[PDB]
Amino acid sequence: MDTFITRNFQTTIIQKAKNTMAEFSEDPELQPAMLFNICVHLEVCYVIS
Amino acid sequence: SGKYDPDLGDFKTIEELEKLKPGEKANILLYQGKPVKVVKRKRYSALSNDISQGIKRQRMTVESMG
Amino acid sequence: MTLAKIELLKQLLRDNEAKTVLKQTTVDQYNIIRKFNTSRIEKNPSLRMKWAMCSNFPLALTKGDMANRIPLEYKGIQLKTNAEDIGTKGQMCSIAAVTWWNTYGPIGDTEGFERVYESFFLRKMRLDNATWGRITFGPVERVRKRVLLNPLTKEMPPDEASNVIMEILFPKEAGIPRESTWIHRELIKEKREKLKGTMITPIVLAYMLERELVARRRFLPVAGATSAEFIEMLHCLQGENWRQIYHPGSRSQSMIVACRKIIRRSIVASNPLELAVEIANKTVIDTEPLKSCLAAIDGGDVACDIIRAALGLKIRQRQRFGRLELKRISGRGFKNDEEILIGNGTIQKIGIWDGEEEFHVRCGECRGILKKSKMKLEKLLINSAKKEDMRDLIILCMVFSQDTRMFQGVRGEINFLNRAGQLLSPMYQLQRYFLNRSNDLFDQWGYEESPKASELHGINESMNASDYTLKGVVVTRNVIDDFSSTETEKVSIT
Amino acid sequence: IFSYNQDYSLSNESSLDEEGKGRVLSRLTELQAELSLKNLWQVLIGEEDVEKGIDFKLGQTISRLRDISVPAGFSNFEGMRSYIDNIDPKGAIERNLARMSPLVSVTPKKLTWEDLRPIGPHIYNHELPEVPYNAFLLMSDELGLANMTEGKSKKPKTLAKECLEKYSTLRDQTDPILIMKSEKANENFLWKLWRDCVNTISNEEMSNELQKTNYAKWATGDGLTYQKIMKEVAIDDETMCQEEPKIPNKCRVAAWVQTEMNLLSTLTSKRALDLPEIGPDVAPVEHVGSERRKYFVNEINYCKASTVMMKYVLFHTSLLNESNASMGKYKVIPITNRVVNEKGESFDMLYGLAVKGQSHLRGDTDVVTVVTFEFSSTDPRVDSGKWPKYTVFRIGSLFVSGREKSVYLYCRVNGTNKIQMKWGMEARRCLLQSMQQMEAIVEQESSIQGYDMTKACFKGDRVNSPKTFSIGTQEGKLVKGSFGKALRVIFTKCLMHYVFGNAQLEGFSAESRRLLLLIQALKDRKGPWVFDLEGMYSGIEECISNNPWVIQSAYWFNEWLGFEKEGSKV
Amino acid sequence: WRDCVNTISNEEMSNELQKTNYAKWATGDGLTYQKIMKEVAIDDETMCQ
Amino acid sequence: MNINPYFLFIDVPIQAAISTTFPYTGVPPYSTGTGYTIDTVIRTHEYSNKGKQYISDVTGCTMVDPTNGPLPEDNEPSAYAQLDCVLEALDRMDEEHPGLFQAASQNAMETLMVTTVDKLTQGRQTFDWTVCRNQPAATALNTTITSFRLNDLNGADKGGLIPFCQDIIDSLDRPEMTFFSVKNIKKIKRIPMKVKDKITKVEYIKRALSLNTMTKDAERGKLKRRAIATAGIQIRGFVLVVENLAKNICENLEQSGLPVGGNEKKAKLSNAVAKMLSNCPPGGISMTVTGDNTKWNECLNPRIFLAMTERITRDSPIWFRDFCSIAPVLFSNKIARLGKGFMITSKTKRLKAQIPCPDLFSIPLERYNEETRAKLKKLKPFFNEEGTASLSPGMMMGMFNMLSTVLGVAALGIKNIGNKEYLWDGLQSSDDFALFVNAKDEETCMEGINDFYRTCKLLGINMSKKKSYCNETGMFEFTSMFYRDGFVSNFAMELPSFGVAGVNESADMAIGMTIIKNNMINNGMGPATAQTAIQLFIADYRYTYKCHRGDSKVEGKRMKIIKELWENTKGRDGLLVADGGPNIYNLRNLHIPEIVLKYNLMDPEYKGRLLHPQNPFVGHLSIEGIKEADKKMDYDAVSGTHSWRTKRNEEQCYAKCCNLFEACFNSASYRKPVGQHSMLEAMAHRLRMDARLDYESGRMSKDDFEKAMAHLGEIGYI
Amino acid sequence: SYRKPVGQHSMLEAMAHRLRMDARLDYESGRMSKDDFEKAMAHLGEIGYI
């Protein structure tokens, strides 16, 4: 899944999602679906704003 | 935008799609089927620009608070 | 035919199995459904073809109105039969009808071949206008390299290639164009205009476009030029003990410069990654963002690799130190901080690698194998490629190995910066110092007897193929081929 | 809130314009489509199920199988898992080695010249029978009924008809003189079958199928076959045993193999091997290639081995065509060839006839029987050990230029299959094997001095002498041989590797290559060591049983090893 | 010509080309015939004035 | 004078003339396989007879466990592998590489969560238990999917391989098992029908664990025959996942010859030998052992592979660790089917009868031949009543190539034993290993070689002391590639590849010319050899398709028409070799299809006729092979009359559903479709839109429209 | 570039002087310890120009 995240998302959004996961002590690697969800959430928020 | 929305009746082709003025609603088929409702765009988009501007605003806010 | 389509659909649905499978399998699952074929593949194609060519009607003709152009028997020669078929539900025919069609019959349109098969005719053009020269029968040194077999109009990754092909020759089923059609808009419109006015089956055009766009790369033994134009003719140009002169009938430097400029602009600021990616995806080269040639070539300069990492792309996982490309072979090095006195008399606290290690080392055209222990270089094997490249390889491997002799060979000072005005780590400061003054550690390094052997021969400090070589350095008159398993392993970006 | 199915819920409908909602929905739909294409959509789990993870638990039977499939000393797979995850070996290999018996080891012994001994000494022994001729067709004994033709290519039946028409004495011969009936075949069956063959070939009708269809059934032995019953009766009956395996005979070195090797590797005024044209050569490299190709074909074309190879290829092609076209009817097949002389006269040569049995076979490994009658000028009584499988006649005599010589007919029953039948038409690759190596040879020479030597190696020039290999021997004195003769020898070696090829040949070559490479290492003073020499020797020599080429290869290997031993003194 | 202008516009004192590729392949300097020993030419039949 | 071809080696090195030694021009050996299978079972159990012998209580078949068994006291092959030593080798490999195991396992898991069930359709013939035969992988998978539907098993419709493996593991617990079996009912005619058959749990377990056998006839360079085993579909997913994991691990390992093929392998070989030559101490000797392992799969216990899988996934999700450990479990309890049985005949009555394997022991052994007598007297203990042999220990050839290679590389990488003054390293690939041992003299070199041999014997690996030898570095052979003094002759074995590809005229020609050019690039085939290969290939191509030069006086059905075309068209240099045209191909233009090559030389009428936009000889469904020629080789051809196809030699359900979907959505045939809806509704919507567009364009009549819409409404989509 | 005591000096003499000066400079800058210094002068003493 991580390959799809790298391809379809910018490195900036990935970094923000990884930082958010770290704040919650959640490993992005062990929960790639959650990382994708957070990246999509950030992307849609930026797109709205 | 939206689902099938049969109010438009049957689907319309790309050539007939262009006839619709900006902001209209049309009933189209996406990929292999998948009926959906679409709206003609009034602009050209750039997702990368939007993301970059959002990041710029975010870091401007971070610096201003800092 | 649409009525025939609906009638066939109704007849198929009349059976309950069709009704239950169609209403059960989603569109995505269709692929699986297609792959449930017999797979009763012919065991020996040669024997099958031989037998079939002798049969009365081996050709499987598709049902249609074409057959009426030709009688079932012409000039007393049987051509086609009206018997029904079960395998294909069409008719049967013989090569006699094919030859007659090549002789007489409907005359088609010649326009389509001017542009549809553009790649093949470009191949022929490059062959015809090529200029040949002499033949050198002497032995040829060849290196195994990852080369592109055929030239490409615009190299793109397979998924982008498929999406572009669909956007070209499949106007329907084009939901939500991705961030790939705008990049290749010129290619889209050019191919669309060129292929318009044809009647060839769409699958043929799709496969030809895939060949024309999707890259094909392989390991090959090459000597000399490496562009796809020369690789096309590599079977004639090269030779184990013979070589031929051939001249077949840019953006790279610009992208290098642009990536370097972006790196320098972004580094000086804080949070360089976001600024760098903003400029990279906001840049353009005359028709397209930077994700049109970066995604084309494999790897490249370190700046391009860093930018690709900042963007979304795959980069070869070779370790870049200065100019050296390093590939670990074995051993694990423990990076531990240590306080070491430099030859200038100053004392620096830097990280040193405890333990033995070995790396394939590349620099420009120079390849070699380096084996190093902690605080010492042990062995280095190289091939004679170029004086400049060999000197760069020697010096850079010297600095990287962190040999105590290299530290004791310093004579000037280490306080340099970059174009952005930043103080670097002592390793890169030493790299710059030694590259600027190559004749600093070379003099005090010490010399070693020549590698007495059949082929192993030494090299002196001046890079000339002269005996009484450097301690450890060895030049073998063979071919060193390295850098296997380009896994492109997952790499993070800070 | 936005969903992947193009629907949304907004607290206020004026917060976002049409464009914003459309764009977000388009991005979501694109993400969904890309995930579905990558099959991640089903795997993807939303913001309520992403806290669970994949579920894949083992049932009862599989768990029990895992429990009982643990190495010795364990009693449950949980125990093994914990042991592997926790225990750390820090020298277990040395602990095991420190106790393993010292009676196990590679037994490393250095290999010297004396250790190497001749392979397959039993061939020398005279008590064993001389190896027989088991090849499909005669090679150095073929008699070509040659008819000059304008060049027209005609059906083989008509060609054989005309060839016999020219030689009325042999066509109409009807009283045979049995020279030898080998062991089992019946003279009456074979002679009557041959007479039917001649009558069918000479008949007015274009049909080339046997007109008897019943006498051949017993002549070819098709009816002499067992009848299959069901398993129950075989179980009940006590006399239905299992046939003991039939091992090949252990034979000795013959003499006909050497003579054929010599004769097939000599120039003949007759040439048959012809090749299609290719496009004009414009590059210098293809010009050099054309020169080399011409120099090679000028040599190979005139060797008799090329004619034999073409005869084999044509016969097998015709056999395959007849089998595919005709399945359950006996057929007549001339062994035809086409031969162009130096003057350009395209003679058609008839070498004999063959009756093809019933080839109605679904599979490929199934055997089809064919009986071959071959014209020859050799009286077998000169060497009866070469022909223990052949029943022959003496069907007359002929004059080639005024020197009368007899003409016999060698008759033999044999069997083939679709695999060998196809490989017959793929036997032309021998030519390639003959060129590749020589090409390499020439290229090596070109590497030494810059210019091209293909004229120098073949014929020589004013600066370099013609290249000569070591080819033969006589009275213990090895003899050199021109480049062309060496190329001929290699081509004949490849042709024999084909014709006498079977399991024994493969097992012999692939296992004697070990000794070949060991000798090569010894000649370079690499001091090769071996672990079990007698094992390799036994492996090699368990293949020299009855294949004539294998026995002659063993003989030549022993002779060459003796030569290398005597020459190693320097 | 591009290589020539690049060399002219650089900073090194020397006026020496460093990209010898196009210079070598443009003036037909690689198409010159190779001289062989006279004996081969005498033996050869295709070598004519 | 007596000729002697061997004398060629007096004036030439063997490696230079090595190509002539191999008899790769004659008929390869070809074949009952029951004897060979029984012999293989006998040898497999014999090597491990000293292990722990117990009886499986899940299936009732005898099992022999050699792992952790007695240490061998003789040179004979030993399957007694010590688990602790295997774990030590794995730990040393892990230490020598940075988290390679974790990366490989994670990547395998990720690509597994993306894999679909249909990937199991690839490969070769597979054992089908519904019929207890060997059937094409696609057909076997389809039949098992169909059977599972009856016993409340699902997941194939769910897509990914995870649900399919989950319900496969579930199936082993169902108290019954229903499926469809072929019934050849007599009616005289033998008509096949489908009969709903049922089998119990033990029978189904045995069927799933059974390994079908066949004779490896295609072999070229081996006198004695070996038996190749095909496994069922219920092991294909797990074996595939473990093989992918092992490939991921071994690809990074520089000691692994697989999966890289071609010039890459030569590069690795030369690089390794150069490395070892560089690493030699001063005046020391680096000896190369040319090894050819034997019994490479009759000594490898699947329990060792289970341990390797568990250790490799040390840090991974529990579910994945359990999933990837199923294949070693299934292989550790496998059963072997036994050919078709022996044949007994009486010559006094001209009677013969083949005895099916289940009846092997229904006959007094005094009637089989003495050799088969001993074979059966030794096979009796493990013989199952149904006619199968219980074969727990060892592996059949071809299953775990990557995992066995990884174990071999683990053995290689130890690099030292007891800190003795030597080192070793080498190349290993699927039963072929070449070793290099560096020391200060020959004696220490062989001390190291013996130590490595002993270490191999501690893992079930038993290098062949008869097929192996040792010499000085710089001359050896690896996987039939010979290295000598830097010269790596690609042993010319691609000769049996110049025959027509048997797909069609243009495609066969393109494949042949590409083969010639690739051989020139790779194997060093000289220009003269390539020209002669072109000549021979063109001869065979003209002969096989009955199309020679129009001028030539040869007679034939198509030849008369070719003759007619020869003078009916003026431009005679543009015809194709399939139309009796003159050959034009040479070395310089093997990379160009001839149709484009002769495009200028053709005549307007000829090119119009041949390159017609529509050809009854060209069909859409015939395009499947236009990309890859069956190994999948890429070839470049051109659409034309000569692009035809040969005649053919829930089936119809799936086949016609897919065909109709392709005919509706022409884009489906090229790229995977996307959608979360039933196929029926997609087709209905597309057909409704197409009907409306056809009418609006005037291509369909009004009555036609009404009929189409009536049918669509009957379908229930309007 | 030019440190040769040219002017008919024997090349061995020039080498001896060059190595003497190089050892002196190495010791003065600290590139060599006193042990290496004395070893080098020992060998240079054995040369004959020292």
Numbering used by the authors:
A (entry chain A): 1 to 49
B (entry chain C): 701 to 766
C (entry chain C): 1 to 249, 256 to 500
D (entry chain A): 147 to 716
E (entry chain D): 340 to 388
F (entry chain B): 1 to 31, 34 to 189, 201 to 643, 652 to 670, 684 to 752
G (entry chain E): 703 to 752
What do the authors of the reporting publication say about this deposited model?
In the nucleus of the infected cell, influenza polymerase (FluPol) uses the viral genomic RNA (vRNA) as template to perform synthesis of either capped and polyadenylated viral mRNA (transcription), or unmodified anti-genomic copies (complementary or cRNA), which then serve as the template for vRNA synthesis (replication). First, it stabilises the formation of the replication complex, an asymmetric FluPol dimer comprising a replicase, which is part of a parental RNP and synthesises the genome copy and an encapsidase, a newly synthesised apo-FluPol, which binds the 5’ end of the nascent RNA replicate to nucleate formation of a progeny RNP.
Consistently, the majority of particles in the apo-FluPolB-hANP32A cryo-EM analysis are dimers and monomers, with a minority of trimers. A minority of particles are apo-FluPolB trimers, whose overall structure was determined at 3.57 Å resolution. The FluB replication complex is only seen as part of a trimer (determined at 3.57 Å resolution overall), with an additional monomer, FluPolB(S), making a symmetrical FluB-type dimer interface with the replicase. The encapsidase component of the FluB replication complex cannot simultaneously make a symmetrical dimer as it uses the same interface (i.e. the PA-arch and PB1 β-hairpin) to interact with the replicase. This shows that the encapsidase component of the apo-FluPolB symmetrical dimer would have to disassociate to be able to form the FluB replication complex.
